[PDB]
RNA sequence: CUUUAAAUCCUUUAACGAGGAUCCAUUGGAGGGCAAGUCUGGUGCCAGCAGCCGCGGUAAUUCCAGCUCCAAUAGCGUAUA
RNA sequence: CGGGAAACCAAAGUCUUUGGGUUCCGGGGGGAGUAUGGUUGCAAAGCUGAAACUUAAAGGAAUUUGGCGAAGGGCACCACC
């Protein structure tokens, strides 16, 4: 029942030393357990399955069908993720899809439109993503417009906490996995676009590896 | 049926009908 | 198993094929001296074959006298027993499937 | 059998059952509210694909 | 475009006109032959006279006898077959009467497993076929 | 009573006037797109449904009838521009 | 580096973060490079070039068993020496 970790990040988040996962996103440390997310995010992390499809390799004994399951994850205050797991039984494929979506959640920032009043509601710039042959655009919107898109990026943008935007899609958007990954790597690009208010020189604080290393090396071997 | 002999048959049919039209007048 | 010899109805008059054409179409010279292009049913597509010079229980159309529909195909012994009954006349052409006509 | 050219045979030889009593209307203020609260509050679907309101099983 | 001059308008307009002429849906609506060859002559519905009842077969694997009606038009005078829609409704139509025909739903193309038809039957003998099938009305003698 | 060339339409006001308030709300659908039944009985690649995939083979979530249910609801469905 | 559906590409790159300039050319697959009209040519034949009708597929890249009158190996006294 009780969790015992593998890496050092498990000790760092269980010894009441990592206050928030924004430090992990700042230092871009890789994550390899679906349970630091359980520690930092509570019941706000919903799970809704997108699509179940069969994939078939076929041999002399006929086709054997493993099942591919897309799921999209994310709390409604920021972070949103996606994960694809394919196996034979439906339930373990669904559970592995939840786990792999739970690892790869990306933080997002939200901007304004026209005037910078109140809490942010839309994406700050025009960002896109590239995978396969599909295009997903994220155009900022005036307040109260809502998300206008296909139902799958409607689900993704409502789950991510985006109140409103404008989209446009090009290409063979019938393949839902490629289209969902295009939306995922489009919304993950809302950081990687330098804006003039981020122009000042950053300061580097102490890394969490340097923060408690003497306690870390004595609390695990 | 490849395109070479299909073109040859259409050419022969066109030549035959053109000869029949020019000798019919 | 020896099935029961079903009889004709008003629209199931006895007929015999004289020549089979292509395109999945069958043509039979009926016993009333009429010719019908007789269409093969879904059950009779690949499970059984209508060979030539055999009697065919055709299905007539009540609104046109051009096409027929098939009801059932008969084997040789049931055809000979129906011949011995006398429902169909003496000018039938089985003749141990002769090709002369 | 008669022929294969008969029309309306399934319409012809089928059974006949008369109609029943008369239902109540109030222009959708409870006809759809009943199925809404059954779908959203009363009937709780188990984790899976879907669940319908006309499940006669 | 790829011809991108500031004083290039007539070349772009002529190229757009030619490449729009190289089409199918625009060429159907902006040519006289595509409407002249239409049996209705550009009309929605048309009336006709029944001359012969023809029964046609079906296409590949799905095989059934579909029953249609050969109609001669009033405004034009060409024999055009028409498919009676519902179950057992061929008993209503007799020969040498009046029938109202209309399209079946793909803008002038064969639909489903019936080979070589385009048009269905809506009204026969100046009464609706739906009321004849349902039982709300009855064919006058 | 009023309006109006004179009325009818509407507004106003007497006497009547709802408990299956019979003073009776229809149109297309129920496999996927596309909200809504492995319901029952009948013919069982026939009859038919189906704008597209496809359902019809005597275990029909699609045909033909009865029950329930969803959609807009005095409106709804179909065809041609 | 980057791009593409992928084979692949220092160009097939600098493309939703689209805009250096400028000719020809394609809108599902058949019908069909066919008929007619013009034009060129001794002849053969080149150039321009449809429609009616029909169909829900025709096509491009690539992974697993399949099958070779393709090649390369391994094993067996129910194959051989």
CATH number, domain containing residue A35: 3.30.160.20
Q: Does residue E70 sit at the C interface (CB-CB below 8 Å)? A: no
Beta pairing partners, A47: A73
**C10 contacts in D (CB within 8 Å)?**
2
Protein residue closest via CA to C1' of G3: A130
Protein residue closest via CA to C1' of F77: E130
Kindly list the distances between the CA atom of residue D38 and the CA atoms of D26, D34, D35, E84, in Å, as whole numbers in the listed order.
Answer: 18, 6, 5, 44
Distance E23 CA to G27 C1' (A): 7
Q: List the domain range (segments joined by +) for residue E126.
A: 1-141
Domains in chain E, number: 1
Number of residues written out for chain D:
57
Token pair listed for A122: 């839309």
Stretch (H or E) spanning E16: helix E10-21
Q: List the domain range (segments joined by +) for residue A13.
A: 8-106
**DSSP 8-state assignment for residue C60:** B
Contact yes or no for E87 and D10 at CB 8 A: yes
**DSSP 8-state assignment for residue E90:** G
CB atoms within 10 A of CB A130: 13
Contact yes or no for C69 and D2 at CB 8 A: no
- The nucleotide minimizing the C1' distance to residue E2's CA is G22
SS3 C24: coil
Q: How far apart are CA D55 and CA D39, in angstroms?
A: 12
SS3 D48: coil
State the smallest CA–CA distance between residue D15 and chain C in angstroms: 25
* Pairing status of strand C35-39 against strand C67-68: parallel
Q: How far apart are CA A33 and CA A116, in angstroms?
A: 38
Q: Are A76 and A161 in contact (CB under 8 A)?
A: yes
Radius of gyration of chain E (CA): 22
Cβ-based neighbours of C28, under 8 Å, separated by 6 or more: C15, C16, C17, C18, C35, C36, C38, C56, C58, C68
Q: Does residue C63 sit at the E interface (CB-CB below 8 Å)? A: yes
Token pair listed for B2: 């490849």
Beta pairing partners, C15: C30, C56
The end-to-end CA distance of chain A, in Å, is 22
CB atoms within 10 A of CB A27: 12
Q: Does residue D5 sit at the C interface (CB-CB below 8 Å)? A: yes
Distance A61 CA to F34 C1' (A): 37
Q: Are C81 and C2 in contact (CB under 8 A)?
A: no
Beta pairing partners, E66: E56
Q: Are D11 and E88 in contact (CB under 8 A)?
A: yes
Cβ-based neighbours of A111, under 8 Å, separated by 6 or more: A120, A122, A123, A124, A125, A140
Q: How far apart are CA E9 and CA E12, in angstroms?
A: 5
| Chosen from D5, D7, D9, D16 to mutate, greatest number of chain E CBs within 10 A | D7
Interior angle at CA D14, CA D54 and CA D8, nearest 5: 110
**Which residue from A59, A72, C12 is spatially nearest to D2, judged by alpha carbons?**
C12
State the smallest CA–CA distance between residue D10 and chain C in angstroms: 17
Q: How far apart are CA A9 and CA A20, in angstroms?
A: 12
State the smallest CA–CA distance between residue D16 and chain E in angstroms: 14
User: Is there contact between D50 and strand F, defined as CB under 7 Å from any strand atom?
Assistant: yes
Positions of chain F reached by protein Cβ under 7 A: 20-22, 24-25, 28, 30, 36-39, 41-43, 45-52, 54-57, 63-74, 78-81
Q: How far apart are CA A183 and CA A156, in angstroms?
A: 8
Give the CA count within 13 Å in the CB-facing half-sphere of C43.
5
Stretch (H or E) spanning B19: helix B3-24
Chain D residues 5-34 within 7 Å (CB) of strand F: 5-11, 13-20, 22-25, 27-28, 31-32, 34
Kindly list the distances between the CA atom of residue A138 and the CA atoms of A76, A108, A119, E3, in Å, as whole numbers in the listed order.
Answer: 18, 13, 19, 31
Contacts 24+ apart (CB under 8 A), E55-63: E55/C61, E55/C63, E55/C64, E55/C67, E55/D5, E56/E81, E56/E114, E56/E115, E56/E116, E56/E117, E57/C39, E57/E115, E58/E113, E58/E114, E58/E115, E59/E113, E59/E114, E59/E115, E62/E113, E63/C41, E63/C42, E63/C45
Q: How far apart are CA C54 and CA C73, in angstroms?
A: 8
Q: Does residue D9 sit at the E interface (CB-CB below 8 Å)? A: yes
| Angle formed by the axes of helices A176-187 and A151-159, nearest 10° | 30
State the smallest CA–CA distance between residue C91 and chain D in angstroms: 25
Chain gaps in chain C, named by the residue before each (C–N > 2.5 Å): none
Q: Are E41 and E22 in contact (CB under 8 A)?
A: no
Q: Are A71 and A97 in contact (CB under 8 A)?
A: yes
Q: Does residue D4 sit at the C interface (CB-CB below 8 Å)? A: yes
Overall resolution, Å: 3.8
Q: Give the method of determination.
A: cryo-EM
Location of structure tokens 């039938």: C92
The secondary structure of chain A, three-state, reads CCCCCCCHHHHHHHCCCCCCCHHHHHHCCCCCCCCHHHHHCCCCEEEEEEEEEEEEEEECCEEEEEEEEEEEEEECCCCEEEEEEEECCHHHHHHHHHHHHHHCEECCCCECECECCCCCCECCCCEEEEECCEEEEEECCCCCCCEECCHHHHHHHHHCCCCCEECCEEECCCCHHHHHHHHHHHHHHHCCCCCHHHCCCCCCCCCHHHHCHHHHHHHCC
**Which residue from A109, A111, A122 is spatially nearest to A188, judged by alpha carbons?**
A109
**Chains contacting C (3 or more CB pairs within 8 Å):** D, E
Token pair listed for C101: 């006509």
Contact yes or no for C9 and D1 at CB 8 A: yes
Q: Does residue E90 sit at the C interface (CB-CB below 8 Å)? A: yes
Q: Does residue E53 sit at the C interface (CB-CB below 8 Å)? A: yes
Interior angle at CA A130, CA A128 and CA A131, nearest 5: 145
| Option in E55, E65, E88 nearest D8 (CB) | E88
Location of structure tokens 């790869």: A104
**E65 contacts in D (CB within 8 Å)?**
4-5
Q: Does residue C43 sit at the D interface (CB-CB below 8 Å)? A: no
**DSSP 8-state assignment for residue C35:** E
Helix, strand, coil percentages in chain C from 3-state DSSP, rounded to 5: 10, 25, 65
Q: Are E95 and E54 in contact (CB under 8 A)?
A: no
Q: Does residue C83 sit at the E interface (CB-CB below 8 Å)? A: no
Contact yes or no for E87 and D8 at CB 8 A: yes
**Chains contacting E (3 or more CB pairs within 8 Å):** C, D
Beta pairing partners, E54: E68
Beta pairing partners, C17: C28
Stretch (H or E) spanning E120: strand E119-124
Q: How far apart are CA A50 and CA E9, in angstroms?
A: 49
Token pair listed for A96: 């592995």
């Amino acid at each position: 029942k009780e969790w015992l970790p593998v890496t050092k990040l498990g000790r760092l988040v269980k010894d009441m030393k990592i206050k928030s996962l924004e430090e992990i996103y700042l230092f871009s440390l890789p994550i390899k357990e679906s349970e630091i997310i359980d520690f930092f995010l509570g019941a706000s992390l919903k799970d809704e399955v997108l699509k179940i499809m069969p994939v078939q390799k076929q041999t002399r004994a006929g086709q054997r069908t493993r099942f591919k399951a897309f799921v999209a994850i994310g709390d409604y205050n920021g972070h949103v993720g996606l994960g694809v797991k394919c196996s034979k039984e439906v339930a373990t494929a669904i559970r592995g899809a939840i786990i792999l979506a739970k690892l790869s959640i990306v933080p997002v920032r939200r901007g304004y439109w026209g005037n910078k009043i109140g809490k942010p509601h839309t994406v700050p710039c025009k960002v896109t993503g590239r995978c396969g042959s599909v295009l997903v655009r994220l155009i900022p919107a005036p307040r109260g417009t809502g998300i206008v898109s296909a139902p799958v990026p409607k689900k993704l943008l409502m789950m991510a906490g985006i109140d409103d935007c404008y989209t446009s899609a090009r290409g063979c958007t019938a393949t839902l996995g490629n289209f969902a990954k295009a939306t995922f790597d489009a919304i993950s690009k809302t950081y990687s676009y330098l804006t003039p208010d981020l122009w000042k020189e950053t300061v580097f604080t102490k890394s969490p590896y340097q923060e408690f290393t003497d306690h870390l090396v004595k609390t695990h071997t | 049926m490849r395109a070479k002999w299909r073109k040859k048959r259409m050419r022969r049919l066109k030549r035959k009908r053109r000869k029949m039209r020019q000798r019919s007048k | 198993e020896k099935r029961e010899l079903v009889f004709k109805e008003d629209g199931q008059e006895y007929a015999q094929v004289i020549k089979m054409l292509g395109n999945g179409r069958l043509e039979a010279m009926c016993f009333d001296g009429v010719k019908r292009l007789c269409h093969i049913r879904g059950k009779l597509r690949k499970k059984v074959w209508i060979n030539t010079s055999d009697i065919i229980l055709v299905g007539l159309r009540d609104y046109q006298d051009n096409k027929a529909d098939v009801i059932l195909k008969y084997n040789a012994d049931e055809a000979r027993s129906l011949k011995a009954y006398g429902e169909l006349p003496e000018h039938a052409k089985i003749n141990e499937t002769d090709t002369f006509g | 059998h008669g022929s294969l050219a008969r029309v309306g045979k399934v319409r012809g030889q089928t059974l006949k059952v008369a109609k029943q009593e008369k239902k109540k209307k109030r222009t959708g203020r409870a006809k759809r509210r009943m199925q809404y609260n059954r779908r959203f509050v009363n009937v709780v679907p188990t984790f899976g694909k879907k669940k319908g309101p006309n499940a006669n099983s | 475009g790829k011809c991108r001059g500031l004083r290039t308008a007539r070349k772009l307009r002529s190229h757009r006109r030619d490449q729009k002429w190289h089409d199918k849906q625009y060429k159907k609506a902006h040519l006289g032959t595509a409407l002249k060859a239409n049996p209705f002559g550009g009309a929605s519905h048309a009336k006709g006279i029944v001359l012969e009842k023809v029964g046609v077969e079906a296409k590949q694997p799905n095989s059934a006898i579909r029953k249609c009606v050969r109609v001669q038009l009033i405004k034009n005078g060409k024999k055009i077959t028409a498919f009676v829609p519902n179950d057992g409704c061929l008993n209503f139509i007799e020969e040498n009467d009046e029938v109202l025909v209309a399209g079946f739903g793909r803008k002038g193309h064969a639909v489903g497993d019936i080979p070589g038809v385009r048009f269905k039957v809506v009204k026969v003998a100046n009464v609706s076929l739906l009321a004849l099938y349902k039982g709300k009305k009855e064919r006058p003698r």
